[PDB]
Chain A
Amino acid sequence: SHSVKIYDTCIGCTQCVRACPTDVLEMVPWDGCKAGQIAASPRTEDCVGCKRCETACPTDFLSIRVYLSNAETTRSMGLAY
C-alpha cells in the first residue's frame, strides 16, 4: 500500500514493533551499533496510516518514517464492508 522508510538511528528499543497493530515490521540482523537487529518493513501491503509506530520511536528525529502513498485499496482503506 503506502511506503515505509527506514534509517540508521534505530537504537533497537523495539517500541514500534510492539505498537504497530498491522504486522508490518521485523528486526532483521544488524551489526553497526549495540542493536545488532534493526527494524524494517517486510509486509507493507497491510499498512494502515495510523502511524502509531514512530510515536513509539524515542530516537531523536525518530528512526522510522512512512511515505503515505496513493495506491489505496480495500485493504489499505480498512473496510469491513
Chain B
Amino acid sequence: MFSASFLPSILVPLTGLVFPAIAMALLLIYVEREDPSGI
C-alpha cells in the first residue's frame, strides 16, 4: 500500500453498518416518545 497504517482496512464497517444501526434505532424510539419530554 502506502505510508499510512491499516486504517482503510477496517474503519468502513462500523460507519457502514453499526452507526446506521444505532442511528435508526434511536430514531425509531424517538418517534414514539411520551409527553411532554423527549430525547
Verify whether A and B have any Cβ pair under 8 Å: no
